[PDB]
Design an enzyme around this catalytic site. Structure first.
Site, PDB file in Angstrom:
ATOM      1  N   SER A  74       2.324  -9.672  -0.466  1.00 23.78           N
ATOM      2  CA  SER A  74       1.881  -8.283  -0.390  1.00 23.78           C
ATOM      3  C   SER A  74       2.213  -7.587   0.926  1.00 23.78           C
ATOM      4  CB  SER A  74       0.383  -8.183  -0.699  1.00 23.78           C
ATOM      5  OG  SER A  74      -0.391  -9.013   0.155  1.00 23.78           O
ATOM      6  N   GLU A 107     -10.343   6.643   3.502  1.00 24.81           N
ATOM      7  CA  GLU A 107     -11.089   5.680   4.303  1.00 24.81           C
ATOM      8  C   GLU A 107     -10.208   4.470   4.566  1.00 24.81           C
ATOM      9  OE1 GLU A 107     -13.148   6.252   1.092  1.00 24.81           O
ATOM     10  OE2 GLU A 107     -11.902   4.810   0.019  1.00 24.81           O
ATOM     11  N   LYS A 133       0.806  -1.234   0.000  1.00 23.03           N
ATOM     12  CA  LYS A 133       0.000   0.000   0.000  1.00 23.03           C
ATOM     13  C   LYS A 133       0.828   1.268   0.000  1.00 23.03           C
ATOM     14  CE  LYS A 133      -4.345  -1.520   2.130  1.00 23.03           C
ATOM     15  NZ  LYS A 133      -4.055  -2.890   2.476  1.00 23.03           N
TER      16      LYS A 133
END
Ligand code: NA
Ligand code: NA
Ligand code: NA
Lengths: 379, 384
Positions: free
Chosen positions: A366, A104, A82
């Site tokens: 990830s 969010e 991310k």
């Protein structure tokens, strides 16, 4: 804005101008010399890119089939892919003259990524999070506050990610002049699915160069977990035109695909409009996964498209299968994976067994599993 | 064996044979092509080396003095520099023909590092840990279990590191034919202080190359926190012969240097022999070795490595202390200013660098060794 029949820009008139301004700015900066210099500089010196491609020799031998390589996004600053998107958009926001980032978050994982990037670039960060999610993610809430972000509990509706999205959009309508809305996956109205995929494509470009260095050929399969789909799009995208590379997205199977407690949007969802995009969503039905990051009820339109044209296959792995893979990778390779990533590991282990020893699988790892230790201890 | 007058091999004859075999093997493997190729392969593809050197622009601007660079050991696999040594020694053990790793641990952070490296190389791992320390560090004990290591709680004696050390040595005397004893800092009898420093020197070699690339010159000061002293030696060692480069080691000042609750062995300890080395250890008025304290688990250690004792004596390095309160302030400051949550250990170095930077000019350069990340510390920072 369209990936065949999926995507679009389903927003009120008030957000059309802001989104067109963002599209205009992105088109300018994406191939700009100064933007790319600064982006690569932060990705290198702050995030620690490139991440390695690791040959899991012991896991490969234990299964007894195809070679399993792990793209180590678990090693990026923050412990999750991310960060790549958070840096990209926060830098874009800064060069657009914005002073504030909003986002969010459900897991708190994108919230933390956004808080980190905002701190780095000296921007105010407000994170919208459903009150029920705040209770499930006390440590991520604390992380966000340590990083100088304001966590805004959302107490409307079901008090989950769906409701946090609505409050964030309502915020952006009023504040877009100085605020960038930092979407965390390949979701939302155009241009966000494209922008987020572009900022994650670095994963696949590195992975391609690294596997050619290691093995002299492209992988037979690439396996990645799919929430909204950003880590999967990031690793998939540079291989899409390589026809012989199989692409497998792994969604959260939860308690089982016929149990009503999963997040397999592509597998079981219906096509419809939500979060400004036309894509698959569960029906509006709340999702479930042991992996917090796989609990978005929808999925990115570019994955819906790749499924439609049969370029990528989409499967599901249950909570128990993911937990098993979490323990397996930890004990066998000394890498504690994120529970999200453990879904990809779980499916890769099943797939590797049926393939031959000369074939190659790349698993996108990830994130790291430090965040999940309390859940795994209990489960 | 010696660093000036410090170091040595103060052990019984049962350990001399095992240590001699280790010294012989290390001397052979340290410059070996195949060993170094394998080591660098694991450091690159598994640990993610090299770590970056980061210019903390916002922190630099806020303080308004010297440029502050952070050597980002927080980004190594596991989140701490300890991995570099764990891989080095585990690989050395494998090429020596050993099938098993043993280690002691207090904070569980070396235990985790050893467990990860053992899992990587397919080696059995038994970690000795005092029963009092097991209670304090349950998540690290769980991490070690997940990684396939067997945590052995030591219930005999005072139920702390000293008892774990004795159990580990007792084990190694019997099993050295197939077991390697993996020490986690620049401590213990020879050859361990040398071996651990050598496996951590990659930090300094990278940092030197990186600062020359970034600034076209060597740094004015290098600041690193000091527990036993491995991360500090790692970053210091390649600059030792660069005479202009100031070296500052930051010990845990705890509740204060005059409070009786700190781990500043170089500042306030006296000379002693323990764990096979002649170095500085914290001692009471009666000359007995006394307990240490720090908010940072990795700095809560009453001793220090003999090479730091030497560098202090010849005045090549300066040693200072930072309190729990100052470290916590730095932990928060770095988090909100640069988006990097540092280990509480590393926050001691950040705390001192922030003081030092303020009294320096903007053209000058400090490198801070950011020895780890602070994800592990979030529970104890939340309470504090
Ligand atoms: Na790296
Ligand atoms: Na989903
Ligand atoms: Na000490």
């Amino acid at each position: 804005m369209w990936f065949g029949e999926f995507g679009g820009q389903y927003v009120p008139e008030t957000l059309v101008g802001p989104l067109k301004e963002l599209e205009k700015a992105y088109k300018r900066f994406k191939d700009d010399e100064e933007f790319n210099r600064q982006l690569n500089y932060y990705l290198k010196t702050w995030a620690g890119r490139p991440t390695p491609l690791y040959y899991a020799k012991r896991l490969t031998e234990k299964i007894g089939g195809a070679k399993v390589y792990l793209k180590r996004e678990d090693l990026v600053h923050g412990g999750a892919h991310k960060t790549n998107n958070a840096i990209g958009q926060a830098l874009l926001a800064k060069l657009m003259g914005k002073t504030r980032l909003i986002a969010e978050t459900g897991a708190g994982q994108h919230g933390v990524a956004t808080a980190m990037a905002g701190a780095l670039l000296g921007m105010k960060v407000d994170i919208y999070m459903g009150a029920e999610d705040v209770e499930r993610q006390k440590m991520n809430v604390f992380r966000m506050k340590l990083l100088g972000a304001n966590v805004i509990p959302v107490n409307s509706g079901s008090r989950t990610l769906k409701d946090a999205i609505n409050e964030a959009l309502r915020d952006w309508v009023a504040t877009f002049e100085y605020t960038h809305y930092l979407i965390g996956s390949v979701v939302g109205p155009h241009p966000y699915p494209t922008i987020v995929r572009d900022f994650q494509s670095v994963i696949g470009r590195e992975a391609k160069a690294q596997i050619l260095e290691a093995e002299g050929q492209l992988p037979d399969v690439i396996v990645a977990c799919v929430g909204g789909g950003s880590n999967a799009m990031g690793i998939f995208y540079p291989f899409v035109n390589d026809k012989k590379v199989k692409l497998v997205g792994v969604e959260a199977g939860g308690k089982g695909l016929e149990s009503g407690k999963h997040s397999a949007s592509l597998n079981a969802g219906q096509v419809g409009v939500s979060h400004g995009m036309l894509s698959y969503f569960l029906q509006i039905k709340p999702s479930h996964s042991i992996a917090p990051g796989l609990d978005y009820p929808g999925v990115g339109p570019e994955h819906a498209y790749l499924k439609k044209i049969q370029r990528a296959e989409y499967v599901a792995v249950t909570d128990e299968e993911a937990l098993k893979a979490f323990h397996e990778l930890s004990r066998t390779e000394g890498i504690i994976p994120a529970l999200e990533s453990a879904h990809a590991v779980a499916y890769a282990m099943k797939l590797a067994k049926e393939m031959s020893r000369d074939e190659i699988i790349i698993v996108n790892l990830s994130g790291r599993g430090d965040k999940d230790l309390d859940i795994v201890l209990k489960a």
